[PDB]
Amino acid sequence: ALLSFERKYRVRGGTLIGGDLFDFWVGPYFVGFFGVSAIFFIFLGVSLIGYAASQGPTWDPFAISINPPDLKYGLGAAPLLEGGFWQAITVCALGAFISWMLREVEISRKLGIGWHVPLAFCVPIFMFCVLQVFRPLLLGSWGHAFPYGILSHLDWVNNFGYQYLNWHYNPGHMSSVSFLFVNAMALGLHGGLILSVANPGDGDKVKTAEHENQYFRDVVGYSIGALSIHRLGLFLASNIFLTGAFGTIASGPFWTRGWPEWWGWWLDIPFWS
Amino acid sequence: ADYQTIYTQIQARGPHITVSGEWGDNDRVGKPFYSYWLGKIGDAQIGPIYLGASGIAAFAFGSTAILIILFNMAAEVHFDPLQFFRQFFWLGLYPPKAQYGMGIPPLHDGGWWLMAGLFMTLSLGSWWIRVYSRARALGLGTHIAWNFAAAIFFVLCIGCIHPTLVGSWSEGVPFGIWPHIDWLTAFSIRYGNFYYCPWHGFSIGFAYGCGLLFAAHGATILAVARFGGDREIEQITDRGTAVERAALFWRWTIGFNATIESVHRWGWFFSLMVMVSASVGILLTGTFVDNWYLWCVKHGAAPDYPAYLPATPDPASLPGAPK
Amino acid sequence: CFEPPPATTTQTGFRGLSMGEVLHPATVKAKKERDAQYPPALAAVKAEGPPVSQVYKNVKVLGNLTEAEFLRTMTAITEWVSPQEGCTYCHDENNLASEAKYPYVVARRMLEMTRAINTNWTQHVAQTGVTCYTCHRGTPLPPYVRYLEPTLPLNNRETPTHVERVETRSGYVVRLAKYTAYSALNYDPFTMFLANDKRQVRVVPQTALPLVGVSRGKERRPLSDAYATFALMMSISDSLGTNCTFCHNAQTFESWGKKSTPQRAIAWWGIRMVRDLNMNYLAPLNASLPASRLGRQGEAPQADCRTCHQGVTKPLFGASRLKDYPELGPIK
Amino acid sequence: MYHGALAQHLDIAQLVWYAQWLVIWTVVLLYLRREDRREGYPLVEPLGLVKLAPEDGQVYELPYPKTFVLPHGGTVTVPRRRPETRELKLAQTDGFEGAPLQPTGNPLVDAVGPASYAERAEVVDATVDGKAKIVPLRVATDFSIAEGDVDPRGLPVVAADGVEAGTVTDLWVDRSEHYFRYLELSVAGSARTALIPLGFCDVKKDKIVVTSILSEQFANVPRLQSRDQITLREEDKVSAYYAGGLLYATPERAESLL
Ligand code: BCB
Ligand code: BCB
Ligand code: BCB
Ligand SMILES: C/C=C1/c2cc3[nH]c4c(c3C)C(=O)[C@H](C(=O)OC)c4c3nc(cc4[nH]c(cc(n2)[C@@H]1C)c(C(C)=O)c4C)[C@@H](C)[C@@H]3CCC(=O)OC/C=C(\C)CCC[C@H](C)CCC[C@H](C)CCCC(C)C
Ligand SMILES: C/C=C1/c2cc3[nH]c4c(c3C)C(=O)[C@H](C(=O)OC)c4c3nc(cc4[nH]c(cc(n2)[C@@H]1C)c(C(C)=O)c4C)[C@@H](C)[C@@H]3CCC(=O)OC/C=C(\C)CCC[C@H](C)CCC[C@H](C)CCCC(C)C
Ligand SMILES: CC(C)=CCC/C(C)=C/CC/C(C)=C/CC/C(C)=C/CC/C(C)=C/CC/C(C)=C/CC/C(C)=C/CC1=C(C)C(=O)c2ccccc2C1=O
Ligand code: HEC
Ligand code: HEC
Ligand code: HEC
Ligand code: HEC
């Protein structure tokens, strides 16, 4: 029920708020106040989804979709089945995400390690807020947010892109896509490298830190280093959303023509026109 | 905080290190040089690089590929140097605009494209060899090479293989900054919305998962930096607090956990998978699926919505409506 | 580099699909006002007298009109087409029945065409209608027209830079991108799509599976086709100052029914209609035009969506003079 | 006739849809899941008397043993039975099987909770060469501090009590990765010297701030055994020492922040 070595680390403390109250475990799960609020929201949120969906026409998981309100309704509270559920779902979402996060902080203080993980986790929360809270506020309606449906959310992505004619030309999208790609690659190299060194094959000797470093110098002429590739991978993944946010946020509030036309700033410099 | 996790406070400098391989120790060119600024966020040694056959070959094919592209682009602006720098992003070397089926197409309509494509494949292949071979030489496993092959493969997929299946070079990917991009749209358009391709959906998950995992793995490592969490290798052969802590952190959050070695495996697998899932979906498009959305509807998963503005019948499908 | 909020948004789709228009308020106000320059309708005149067919000499088209009514037209025509030029543009100071000057015969065909758009093409123009003004905007040469090659600037009232001139081989790509909202699409949807009834817009399969007999080899359509239609769409979009979702639900561009807006259907007709005017009206005028007017391959200038629309979903924001000049359609 | 059509209502894309899923679950569940259980398994809780017996589900979950042949000799097999022998200065605070534990002594010294170490090997980590990886500058004469960074040798170490705790005497470099990993300081009004991982030191031009523990507490930092070399277990000891103070240096550390 406990790992071979878990026992020793299981001491009280590190709570953010709450203290000894919820400072305990259930199974492998640590609880804590935020563990108590995480559950609360989830519970509400999943029940909201169940009820809302129970009032729609389909149960096919793929086709079910819970949608935000019509623009008409502005930033105000909307009829239940016409956006209301969506609103309340959104709040639970954030409720859960944020508890999740804080929970991770207490888990970290207890263990005596850095806060980098919850910290890192803020990046995806922030993006959820950009799409669902900030952009619509900027545009003036909750009806510009995305719908909760396995496939139907892709339909929002799609049309959203197409509203700007060719989304691919959105400069924050280019930067976004570009981190998405580097990071996916770095992950493969980082993991292949590690495993290549500890699993040479046959019965050859496990290699060393030195070998990791000759490998890449040899290859690309440069090696970042063991700790630094963790710092970099943390940076590339994050920038996927940090940079993207800009692209998203400009679309509508800061820009209304087609993205390609944005590049006129280059193309149209008078010198070379 | 642990400032070490942000940048290196006190940089060390020492003799350069050289691990010997079964071969090519004599093919390492360059005088290693140090950079102080870079030294803060990474190792400071730039160099040297190893040459060798495969590498040099790779430079060779590659470069050929390139002149080919640049030249055709250069022509695209009737060799005006200035409009060249200017329109760059817009210039490209296209696949055959006409249908020639599988026939080696005229140089003007696609011929130069298939050549470029060739030298790029040769170039990719040689580089592959380098990746595989330098691993073998230093007594390392082939893992990186095996992920790389998956990426080569996807590229091949969307360049030769898919065009080969359906029988039209007209479907390959053009070369150029905006052009390779518009291909995406034209490709999706034609095949009925790629959002409906389950393999696009698989790829995306893995890609996002990639994001999620490097972020978490990275952060996890800095968070234990203090216990030497970074010396991953020795943390595998001899578990330490760092990994113990990193394990229980994840155990207590999500209920389960990996090991220091296994996480690299989940990372590697995820990575590979992005590319593998993509290849499947491309190989299946056109060969067996004409319209992804409709294939989805065929099988009952597409969502449907009410009309907002009134339903609009296809004018063409009306009585005595022109063609 | 950026346009500032707020932004006017509209909804064209079910809640949550992200379908609608995104307009910059100032952009619209400038267009609103330039389009506002549409001269008001001339005061009604009462029909006294004999039809001008008895009255005048060479009156082919408007021969049902009285003198008063007819003159009214002539004045309207003058104001919409060649106001700075006056009647003398098309006429001989002394022989008002003289066909000497080319603008007369053109103007004549123009009357027939105009009257056709308003009578035959109701599917597209509805109760709005077109008048000379619509295209001409108070100039003999409409400001938005197309040759058999991408021309630039878009507005012929601007003076071109060295590079924009159709003669400069290097600016071709720029000239092309400008036609397709800045895209790098290597095609010209006008020559391929709008001058002819030759090519097919539609490129997406209507079955989930590749039907055997059309999916392999030379039996196929090149992927070019797809880039082409995309490009055409960017042009249409940019010509109405709109976005794909004004017309389609990107879930399935190919579907109609609840996937398409009533506007798609209208633009459908718009395609036909511009094909008509082009093939049967505007192109045959190269016979009657000065070389000054023709293009590099002896073609007349022809029309596109932009000609009429000038960057607005409804040309002239929906303004009509239809009731005001029945002489121009629709006909019994 | 369509391409891909199989039966009257079946296509190859469908079949591939399931094969993909199945391939995914196979790897995730039967491969990755078992691999994650190479350390720390099998889990812990009571034995009966005669209850030595294997527990069915405990065998299935683990992968086959893997042997690592080590660079400078020896081997390691995982997973393997590795019980924690060491008596822990902790007491259960309640009945719940999942309630926390409490230190019964001075947790820093007793090495419990954040102040815990792993039973790492009592060996010096080596370079590829066979030499010691982490050694003081004193010895790694080939190494230096880069132009422009602080030369912390001679500066005072200031504890979280704001009090001078000793003066930095040397630095320990990783000869294998050219990275400083510890500062060595001489402790005030004492005989010994301690090490403190670089991650715990805030390097400034005039002091080195260490907020982890209090001056008084430097005296108990784990002592090394050879004066110019450190075993892997020792690194864990030393590092955990200071982490422990993050939770335990003061009575309020362990409590709620708000
Ligand atoms: C036709 C429409 C298009 C489009 C439109 C589009 C839009 C409109 C947007 C993007 C965005 C993005 N696009 Mg793009 N796109 C991308 C890639 C990307 C990503 C880099 C980026 C970020 C995704 C995001 O923000 O999700 C966000 C993910 C979130 C917020 C995750 C929240 C997770 C939460 C924190 C935790 C939740 C937990 C679960 C609820 C609970 C589950 C627990 C269970 C499992 C136990 C690629 C690689 C491609 C390719 C190859 O063509 C492409 C094509 C296109 N995109 C088309 C051109 N794209 C975005 C961007 O940045 O644009 C600049 C964006 O706004
Ligand atoms: C700006 C663009 C966006 C976008 C674009 C996008 C694309 C274009 C694609 C997806 C896809 C998917 N997305 Mg979306 N997405 C999803 C969730 C999903 C999953 C259904 C699927 C794969 C996700 C994945 O593996 O990631 C990495 C996480 C991993 C690997 C761990 C497992 C996470 C688990 C899959 C999440 C499950 C969510 C639940 C089924 C529903 C919630 C739980 C219930 C109990 C409430 C959530 C949780 C949210 C937010 C923010 O809350 C979000 C936001 C967005 N996605 C943005 C709106 N997403 C793909 C798909 O197949 O869609 C149908 C796909 O093709
Ligand atoms: C309107 C068009 C759309 C589209 C069309 C599209 C297509 C057409 C394809 C994808 C594909 C993919 N898209 Mg999708 N897309 C994606 C995400 C993705 C990726 C996960 C996956 C691509 C795999 C990849 O990494 O290729 C990037 C990795 C590459 C290219 C590896 C190259 C490796 C190589 C060894 C590097 C060589 C370097 C050399 C130096 C080169 C030298 C050159 C010289 C010599 C000439 C997201 C996140 C979204 C969002 C947010 O909405 C989205 C929206 C859309 N995509 C739209 C719906 N997408 C692919 C897929 O899965 O298909 C099923 C695909 O083929
Ligand atoms: C740039 C960096 C990135 C990043 C980073 C990190 N990511 C992390 C961590 C870090 C570092 C964490 O520590 C945390 C964690 O523990 O890791 C295990 C986590 C997590 N990443 C998740 C999903 C994931 N990350 C994505 C993306 C990125 N991650 C980007 C790439 C995506 C994408 C791309 O789609 C997904 C879907 C969850 C697994 C997980 C906790 C969920 C949670 O909150 O638990 C608590 C909540 C629940 C278990 C359910 C609550 C249900 C709500 C109330 C009801 C439904 C609401 C919702 C509106 C439904 C809409 C669905 C519809 C579209 C279909
Ligand atoms: C899912 C996992 C993924 C993944 C995985 C992996 N990716 C890998 C590996 C793995 C594992 C490797 O091991 C391999 C490698 O080595 O890593 C360091 C590699 C690589 N991924 C690159 C690019 C990349 N990966 C992308 C994506 C993903 N990757 C996906 C997502 C993308 C995207 C998204 O677009 C990009 C662009 C390259 C840097 C690199 C080698 C390319 C090569 O083969 O080089 C070929 C070399 C050349 C063409 C030399 C050219 C020299 C110039 C032209 C000189 C010009 C001047 C001219 C010579 C003047 C002459 C003058 C005369 C007088 C003398
Ligand atoms: C009284 C009562 C009701 C009690 C309830 C208490 C409570 C809060 C229960 C919560 C239950 C809940 C909500 C459970 C949901 C758990 C969730 C969100 C699970 C998501 C699981 C998923 C899909 C994770 C995706 C990422 C992924 C593929 C992880 C697999 C690989 C792992 C385990 C990575 C974690 C990981 C990383 C990143 C390391 O770096 C690392 C380094 C060294 C050793 C280990 C690790 C490690 O495990
Ligand atoms: C070209 C755009 C014209 C301008 C400017 C003006 N008119 Fe015109 N006119 C034009 C045409 C094509 C015709 C033929 C009409 C038809 O139905 O076939 C006419 C005709 C006349 C006539 C009749 C003369 C005759 O046939 O006996 C008159 C008297 C006339 N137009 C007058 C007129 C005036 C006064 C103008 C300025 C106010 C004017 N026209 C301009 C074409 C053009
Ligand atoms: C868009 C559908 C048009 C409408 C409506 C009308 N005209 Fe037009 N006209 C149009 C084009 C594309 C052109 C050809 C390019 C060119 O400048 O010739 C024309 C031309 C004429 C001309 C000739 C002017 C010249 O070549 O110098 C005249 C006199 C003219 N058009 C008259 C005219 C009248 C009277 C209209 C209303 C009845 C009318 N046009 C409508 C396009 C369009
Ligand atoms: C209305 C003014 C439209 C806007 C805005 C856009 N499109 Fe369109 N599209 C429209 C029509 C009338 C048609 C049918 C043409 C015909 O000859 O029948 C189309 C068609 C498409 C298609 C393909 C159709 C098919 O294969 O069945 C695509 C792929 C398409 N359109 C894409 C598209 C995009 C990407 C747009 C924004 C740039 C866009 N359309 C706008 C009308 C309208
Ligand atoms: C002038 C001869 C025109 C050309 C060329 C094209 N269009 Fe048009 N369009 C014209 C008019 C007079 C109207 C108005 C209808 C009304 O009620 O006022 C329109 C309208 C449209 C619309 C309707 C938009 C709406 O808000 O409902 C669309 C969608 C449209 N036109 C598209 C369109 C396209 C795609 C064209 C090029 C193929 C095109 N039009 C040309 C007049 C003229």
Ligand SMILES: CC(C)=CCC/C(C)=C/C=C/C(C)=C/C=C/C(C)=C/C=C/C=C(C)\C=C\C=C(/C)CC/C=C(\C)CCCC(C)C
């Ligand atoms: C061997 C058998 C018989 C025939 C095989 C045929 C074959 C293998 C064909 C293969 C085709 C393939 C793999 C095609 C693939 C197409 C793909 C993946 C396209 C992707 C293109 C992507 C992009 C962004 C291309 C960008 C290109 C550029 C911008 C080039 C820039 C070059 C520069 C700037 C050179 C500068 C040089 C200087 C000295 C300054």
Ligand SMILES: COC1=C(OC)C(=O)C(CC=C(C)C)=C(C)C1=O
């Ligand atoms: C420990 O893991 C790793 C490193 O540390 C030495 C690297 O330097 C590198 C080299 C990275 C680059 C960008 C050269 C990789 C790939 C890696 O996985």
Ligand SMILES: CCCCCCCCCCCC[N+](C)(C)[O-]
């Ligand atoms: C990214 C969109 C993914 C949607 C994929 C939907 C796959 C549906 C396959 C249903 C197969 C039918 N069935 C169960 C009889 O086999």
Ligand SMILES: CCCCCCCCCCCC[N+](C)(C)[O-]
């Ligand atoms: C593209 C999405 C595919 C991602 C596959 C996700 C694997 C997550 C597995 C969670 C493991 C669950 N567990 C503990 C019960 O094994």
Ligand SMILES: [Fe+3]
């Ligand atoms: Fe790692």
